[PDB]
């Protein structure tokens, strides 16, 4: 006899839309986020097996899509800087790092030509004499971020809608894919700070026992290797160049904010990293890679890519976008303080979204941020050498795909749908 049961403890892999939860101005706000659960107690699904996969994990895809949406909505109503896409008269004020550029705003407000000046970094200036254009003057629209809106990396918890559950893998040394034995059920994920960086991962979680290196396939050198450290390294970075802000009336009712003056002298931006912590960390990484690659030598080299965002380390300290030179760090051979110079940019091609760009107003200088180095994104690139070269593998910093940063924190989670109905044979009527 077929018996119908309801409340049966089964599930199927399924996709749904997850929502933001945060502790409770900033963009991560309660119009999009709700308060967290103060006691999201895990339930151990004693003696179940679940196959997890950090790659092709739709939780990563949602995090990516919503972060993009939040950024677009936040910038949507802000000031267009298109009235400023005119030829600049530029001289100077490390050498000519910052230039004093003069220009004619020929529309502005009231249709008078307004002579005006601003201080710009050379990295945002294109030669066309001493005549210059903005780096992304044409082909895209640059909008100024609104001064009232912050983008702070508040840890965000993703939570399941009713009818859904998130399974979490608590196994040690999970390699990113395959069966997980110690599977628990949770209501929400741990909080993940939506930190954006390239080459080196910042403010993530740490591995429990040792450095764990994960890859979809190690032979396939086209894939990014994600390295999660079990110990963080603290680095502090700064932009010491004290300045004043200049408010320029460009839009009929709005305003553009630029750098008006520099207070005191000019010094290159920089990051302070420990000599010892850094090479001890590499020793640990290299050890694991030596195991993975069967004793061939591990070498660390510089990025050879073509993207300024990748060849330089990239992060955002307060409102200042940093491009730091890490060629000094990835320079070693493992068989048997450090000051990293940095640059600052005002125009950011965020997300690699064609047609869009954003402008970063100055924050008066004298800013220093301390941050946690929690992992690396890097790739292996040698090959066709068994009878040609020595047995050395070379790894270089890699990145630019923002989904990799998010994948590194979601590797242990899977979303399933609960299916309470089922049937089975009995002897009743």
């Amino acid at each position: 006899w077929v018996t119908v049961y309801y409340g049966v403890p089964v599930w199927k892999e399924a996709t749904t839309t997850l929502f933001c939860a945060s502790d409770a101005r900033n963009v991560w706000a309660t119009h999009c986020c709700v308060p967290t659960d103060p006691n999201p107690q895990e339930v151990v699904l004693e003696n179940v097996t679940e196959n997890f996969n950090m790659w092709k994990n739709d939780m990563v895809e949602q995090m990516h899509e919503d972060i993009i949406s939040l950024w677009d909505q936040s910038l949507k109503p802000c000031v267009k800087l298109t009235p400023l896409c005119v030829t600049l008269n530029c001289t100077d004020y490390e050498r000519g790092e910052i230039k004093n550029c003069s220009f004619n705003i020929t529309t502005s407000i009231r249709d008078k030509v307004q002579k005006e000046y601003a201080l710009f970094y050379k990295l945002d200036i294109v030669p066309i004499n001493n005549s210059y254009r903005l780096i992304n003057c044409n082909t895209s629209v640059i909008k100024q971020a609104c001064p009232k809106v912050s983008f702070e990396p508040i840890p965000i918890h993703y939570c399941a809608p009713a009818g859904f559950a998130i399974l979490k893998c608590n196994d040690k040394k999970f390699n990113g894919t395959g069966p997980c034995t110690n599977v628990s059920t949770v209501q929400c994920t741990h909080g993940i700070r939506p930190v954006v960086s390239t080459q080196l991962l910042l403010n993530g979680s740490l591995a429990e026992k040792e450095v764990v290196i994960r890859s979809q396939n190690f032979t396939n050198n086209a894939k990014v290797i994600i390295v999660q450290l079990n110990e963080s390294v603290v680095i502090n970075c700064t932009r010491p160049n004290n300045n004043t802000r200049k408010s320029i009336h460009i839009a009929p009712g709005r305003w553009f904010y630029t750098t008006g003056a520099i207070i005191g002298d000019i010094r290159q931006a920089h990051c302070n990293i420990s000599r010892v912590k850094w090479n001890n960390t590499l020793k640990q990484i290299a050890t694991k890679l030596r195991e993975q690659f069967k004793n061939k030598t591990i070498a660390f080299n510089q990025s050879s890519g073509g993207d300024p965002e990748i060849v330089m380390h990239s992060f955002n300290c307060g409102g200042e976008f940093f491009y730091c030179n890490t060629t000094q760090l990835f320079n070693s051979t493992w068989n048997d303080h450090i000051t990293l110079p940095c640059r600052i940019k005002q125009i950011i091609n965020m997300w690699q979204k064609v047609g869009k760009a954003m402008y970063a107003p100055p924050i008066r200088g004298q800013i220093r941020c301390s941050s946690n180095i929690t992992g690396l994104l890097l790739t292996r690139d040698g090959g066709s050498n068994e009878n040609k070269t020595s047995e050395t593998e070379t790894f270089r910093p890699a990145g630019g795909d923002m989904r990799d940063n998010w994948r590194s924190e979601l590797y242990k989670y899977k979303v399933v749908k609960i299916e309470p109905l089922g049937v089975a044979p009995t002897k009743c009527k």
Partner: antibody
Amino acid sequence: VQLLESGAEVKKPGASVRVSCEASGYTFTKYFIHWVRQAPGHGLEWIGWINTLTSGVNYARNFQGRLTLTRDLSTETVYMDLRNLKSDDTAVYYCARGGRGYDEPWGAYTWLDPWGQGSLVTVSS
Amino acid sequence: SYELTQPASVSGSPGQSITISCTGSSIGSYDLVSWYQQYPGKAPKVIIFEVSKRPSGVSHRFSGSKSGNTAALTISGLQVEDEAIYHCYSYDDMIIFGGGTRLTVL
């Protein structure tokens, strides 16, 4: 799908060449792009590739320090910038889409379906 | 190049079934050898995906084989139109192409 190389060029030894390759009919950022050259008498030699989304690269050893591969997303175009050209580099240089979509375990390899027509670069004194 | 030791050439009469091979040893680490065909004056094209998967547009005459160090292409029912240079494609942490085998039709 189409993929088109710039035309042929002639250089002297100790020179440099810039060869463009334009994509059409597919999302540029969905696939890797590989460069291969056909040298007379040698069959095909793989040179390198770009990611197209992140401009990550990979180059064969004999091109390191002389070859740069870059891209411009707004035109869905990839370029080969090669310096220190020798007469030994005369070859037809081709671009093709690598693999399958980026999000596939072996997605950078085994396809190369849309080979472009190939641009001959001749280096001679 | 390297292990993809293709014969310089093959031939046969129309209707003849023939085999082109490289049988390189570095197969197992990738476990895959694909095949390409090229006409004089033209760009090469894929005839075989992965191992012996025939894509749309490719004739059933073309079917390969892989085993141990075996890497081969069989063209059944050879046509005049099949005259071309054929190549093995492999990988050993890098793409390697064979020198190629020149197929003519008698």
